Amino acid sequence: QISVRGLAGVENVTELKKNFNRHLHFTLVKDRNVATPRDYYFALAHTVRDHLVGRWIRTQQHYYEKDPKRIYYLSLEFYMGRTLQNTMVNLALENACDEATYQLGLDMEELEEIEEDAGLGNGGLGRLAACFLDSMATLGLAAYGYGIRYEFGIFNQKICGGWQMEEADDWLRYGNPWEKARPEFTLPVHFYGRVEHTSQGAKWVDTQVVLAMPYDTPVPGYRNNVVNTMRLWSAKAPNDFNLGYIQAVLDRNLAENISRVLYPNDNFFEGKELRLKQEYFVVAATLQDIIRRFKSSNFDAFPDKVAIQLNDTHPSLAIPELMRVLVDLERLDWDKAWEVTVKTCAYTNHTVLPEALERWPVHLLETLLPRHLQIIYEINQRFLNRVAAAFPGDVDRLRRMSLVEEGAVKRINMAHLCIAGSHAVNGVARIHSEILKKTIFKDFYELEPHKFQNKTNGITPRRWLVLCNPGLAEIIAERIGEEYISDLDQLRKLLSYVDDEAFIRDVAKVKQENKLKFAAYLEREYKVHINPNSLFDVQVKRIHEYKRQLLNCLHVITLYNRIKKEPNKFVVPRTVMIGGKAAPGYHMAKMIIKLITAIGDVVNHDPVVGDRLRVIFLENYRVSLAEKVIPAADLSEQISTAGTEASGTGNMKFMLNGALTIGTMDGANVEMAEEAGEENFFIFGMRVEDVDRLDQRGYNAQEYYDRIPELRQIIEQLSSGFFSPKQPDLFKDIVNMLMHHDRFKVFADYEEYVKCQERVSALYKNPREWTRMVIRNIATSGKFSSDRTIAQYAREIWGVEPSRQRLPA
Ligand SMILES: CC(C)c1ccc(/C=C/C(=O)NC(=O)N[C@@H]2O[C@H](CO)[C@@H](O)[C@H](O)[C@H]2O)cc1
Ligand SMILES: O=c1[nH]cnc2c1ncn2[C@@H]1O[C@@H](COP(=O)(O)O)[C@@H](O)[C@H]1O
Numbered sequence: 001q002i003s004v005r006g007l008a009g010v011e012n013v014t015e016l017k018k019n020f021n022r023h024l025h026f027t028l029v030k031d032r033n034v035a036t037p038r039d040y041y042f043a044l045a046h047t048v049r050d051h052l053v054g055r056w057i058r059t060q061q062h063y064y065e066k067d068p069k070r071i072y073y074l075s076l077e078f079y080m081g082r083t084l085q086n087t088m089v090n091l092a093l094e095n096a097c098d099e100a101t102y103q104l105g106l107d108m109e110e111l112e113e114i115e116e117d118a119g120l121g122n123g124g125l126g127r128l129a130a131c132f133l134d135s136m137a138t139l140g141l142a143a144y145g146y147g148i149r150y151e152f153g154i155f156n157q158k159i160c161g162g163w164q165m166e167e168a169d170d171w172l173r174y175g176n177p178w179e180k181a182r183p184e185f186t187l188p189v190h191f192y193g194r195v196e197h198t199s200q201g202a203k204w205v206d207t208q209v210v211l212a213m214p215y216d217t218p219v220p221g222y223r224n225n226v227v228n229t230m231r232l233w234s235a236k237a238p239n240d241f242n243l244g245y246i247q248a249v250l251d252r253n254l255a256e257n258i259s260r261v262l263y264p265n266d267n268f269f270e271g272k273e274l275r276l277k278q279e280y281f282v283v284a285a286t287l288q289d290i291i292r293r294f295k296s297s298n299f300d301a302f303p304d305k306v307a308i309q310l311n312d313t314h315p316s317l318a319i320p321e322l323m324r325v326l327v328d329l330e331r332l333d334w335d336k337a338w339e340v341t342v343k344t345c346a347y348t349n350h351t352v353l354p355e356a357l358e359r360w361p362v363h364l365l366e367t368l369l370p371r372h373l374q375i376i377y378e379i380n381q382r383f384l385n386r387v388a389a390a391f392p393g394d395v396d397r398l399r400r401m402s403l404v405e406e407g408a409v410k411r412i413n414m415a416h417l418c419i420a421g422s423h424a425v426n427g428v429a430r431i432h433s434e435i436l437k438k439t440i441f442k443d444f445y446e447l448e449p450h451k452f453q454n455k456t457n458g459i460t461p462r463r464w465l466v467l468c469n470p471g472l473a474e475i476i477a478e479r480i481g482e483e484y485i486s487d488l489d490q491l492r493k494l495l496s497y498v499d500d501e502a503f504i505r506d507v508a509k510v511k512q513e514n515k516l517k518f519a520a521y522l523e524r525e526y527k528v529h530i531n532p533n534s535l536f537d538v539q540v541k542r543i544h545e546y547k548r549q550l551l552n553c554l555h556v557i558t559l560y561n562r563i564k565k566e567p568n569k570f571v572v573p574r575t576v577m578i579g580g581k582a583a584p585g586y587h588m589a590k591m592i593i594k595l596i597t598a599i600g601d602v603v604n605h606d607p608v609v610g611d612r613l614r615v616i617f618l619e620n621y622r623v624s625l626a627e628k629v630i631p632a633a634d635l636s637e638q639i640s641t642a643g644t645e646a647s648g649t650g651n652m653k654f655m656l657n658g659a660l661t662i663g664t665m666d667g668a669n670v671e672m673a674e675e676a677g678e679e680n681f682f683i684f685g686m687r688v689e690d691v692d693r694l695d696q697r698g699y700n701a702q703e704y705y706d707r708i709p710e711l712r713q714i715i716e717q718l719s720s721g722f723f724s725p726k727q728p729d730l731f732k733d734i735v736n737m738l739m740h741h742d743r744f745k746v747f748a749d750y751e752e753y754v755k756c757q758e759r760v761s762a763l764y765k766n767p768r769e770w771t772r773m774v775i776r777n778i779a780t781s782g783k784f785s786s787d788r789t790i791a792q793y794a795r796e797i798w799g800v801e802p803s804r805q806r807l808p809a
């Protein structure tokens with residue numbers, strides 16, 4: 001149908017058809033007369049998977065032969081979403097399969113919707129890991145993602161009476177055609193026990209054993225025949241475990257619970273033993289795999305052949321685990337082991353909020369991992385001896401930099417452990433990396449300035465343009481060719497089309513088509529009516545106070561109140577869509593969801609408003625829903641309090657798909673505005689510097705309430721029961737937080753936000769100038785390819801060169 005989707009050659013179409021019919025018969029054990037759409041989805045998935053295996057076998061064989069440096073990306077989350085279309089895109093099979101399925105009387109788009117998301121992450125951190133795997137394969141790096149195969153990923157969100165309900169994401173119920181179990185490569189992991197000090201070093205004994213069984217998933221690079229591996233570990237009881245007879249068998253569940261469910265609490269660190277077991281499980285199994293591979297080729301050259309990237313502090317136990325293996329098992333001297341460890345490990349930080357940092361109670365480590373605790377203490381003593389030698393007499397610095405935190409309960413600060421144990425520490429956007437050096441890790445930067453780096457985040461333009469917005473990808477390809485898909489900086493060529501009347505028309509037409517399709521998706525799946533000519537104003541991300549979905553809510557109420565005040569006055573019509581999951585125990589996030597639906601309930605049924613304003617809560621926001629909504633958006637809401645959002649990546653998704661951004665100077669928004677020009681961005685609100693000045697003086701929300709009548713009306717409406725008639729005190733906790741203990745200064749940015757939103761509406765009334773600004777954003781989005789991000793990691797941290805060269809097919 002369209003060029004960027006590849007050729008539908010007659011041999012290929014014929015061959016896909018027969019393999020499809022073969023899988024339906026032999027693999028699925030069905031015939032056409034009783035096959036369902038799910039069976040057809042699986043027959044297609046197996047058909048496409050067959051095309052990966054040759055390239056997968058020879059990629060891994062290639063790495064065995066050439067023995068390049070291996071990159072191991074350790075993460076507790078890999079938010080992959082669906083695999084079928086992404087695989088087709090990367091192998092150039094999309095049009096072929098579309099034709100093949102069309103000739104069999106089937107609609108491939110309908111079959112794609114049957115696939116469950118692999119929802120093995122919470123949001124940005126998890127999705128970054130997935131974009132990274134795609135880029136590493138695309139750039140020909142010998143890279144392996146290592147994680148946990150959760151039986152239950154991030155919960156499915158249901159809204160009942162406007163409240164979030166959580167239900168289990170049983171994503172493996174119908175099977176996973178992409179993974180290959182490798183029970184033959186199963187490895188033991190130890191827990192509990194005690195440490196014995198013999199003549200010839202320490203021994204960790206009397207341990208309980210859990211087996212780690214790997215499952216391998218192929219990661220195809222974009223049209224280069226490279227297929228890398230994501231290996232995810234599953235927990236299995238040993239066969240002598242607990243060995244009433246019946247109860248001993250039933251108690252195998254206790255060991256296997258390690259890989260049962262992803263922790264969804266992305267706001268607040270809670271030290272739960274089961275999460276600690278998860279974090280050790282992934283690290284212990286992964287490092288045995290790493291060492292095995294290294295030996296099949298003297299630990300002096302270990303850092304020349306291995307790099308380990310720690311995604312946040314979650315796999316930080318890699319540091320003392322590598323030290324344990326090298327010292328206790330391989331018998332290296334401490335100093336040599338430490339040199340090897342530091343040169344192998346690198347750490348990426350994702351938040352400056354102190355309640356998010358992992359600080360594990362010493363008593364849990366003492367019980368669960370007694371040897372690792374001893375090693376952490378030894379690391380700490382040798383580290384603090386260095387601090388003392390560089391800053392003699394600075395006793396407060398010693399307590400500030402310690403890996404061991406004193407108090408009610410002693411804790412280990414895992415971020416301090418990562419910095420001590422890594423040759424490189426990076427933030428994920430320039431302003432965040434600067435904040436790490438100036439504030440939370442200032443002492444460490446002064447000790448070892450060379451460790452600190454910036455690697456601004458990015459997104460893959462395969463999933464986030466070519467896959468989710470083929471219409472846009474095609475109209476771009478028409479003018480500049482297809483090479484921009486693996487070299488996104490080429491989008492700068494589109495600056496020479498900003499005054500091209502045909503291109504302006506095509507960009508606008510693609511957005512209108514995406515909006516019509518999404519408006520049809522909404523009505524069909526959820527029975528809700530929207531105006532497709534309205535401005536689509538969208539904020540989708542996890543629900544957090546720092547992200548300030550509440551500030552958006554206040555703007556929505558302002559618009560409604562303005563309409564009720566002057567109903568016969570023209571306003572630019574809007575559909576305001578907000579979506580995102582709240583962590584199950586985060587009461588305020590749950591209250592915010594209830595407030596959004598409560599606003600919707602009033603606004604959507606007011607006959608005087610009409611179709612000029614609608615407020616939709618987008619239920620169960622996840623990767624597959626992002627792929628639908630982001631191409632339909634006009635305005636991207638990126639409105640966190642300055643200094644709180646480390647980077648953001650949804651922001652980049654919107655930029656690439658033709659939405660304009662309203663945002664604070666926070667995270668990667670700063671760099672996005674720098675690339676596009678501040679004139680082509682709707683910047684508002686306090687800068688980081690302004691936030692600091694307000695903190696020194698003291699934030700008094702009452703001041704803003706006293707001075708801004710429109711804000712006072714909104715707060716009185718919240719308090720009096722305007723948005724909750726039958727429960728008039730429902731939102732008291734929200735009002736109380738806003739007035740007395742708002743860490744994120746919602747009222748301080750309100751006036752500027754509302755003004756800025758008026759400038760958005762003004763520009764939207766001139767479709768031609770709106771579209772021209774859109775083109776200037778799309779054309780300067782190149783820097784935010786995760787290919788650029790990974791090439792920087794490779795050159796500046798891992799010490800490897802990327803390659804765009806094909807492997808032979
Ligand atoms: C130990 C247990 C309690 C636990 C701790 C943390 C998490 C999840 C964190 C997460 O989901 N973090 C996250 O998504 N960060 C975002 O990382 C993105 C990629 O760098 C950034 O763009 C965002 O700014 C950052 O908030 C889950 C469980
Ligand atoms: O002893 C060997 N002989 C031949 N090929 C090997 C041997 N060991 C590893 N390989 C190759 O490398 C492996 C890749 O799997 P991995 O070692 O689990 O990453 C196999 O798939 C082989 O292609």
Ligand SMILES: *Cc1c(COP(=O)(O)O)cnc(C)c1O
Nearest residue numbers: 123124541622623626648649650
């Ligand atoms: C990109 C993405 C995120 C990250 O969004 P932010 O706006 O950067 O927080 C979260 N969830 C999903 C499903 C995503 O695709």
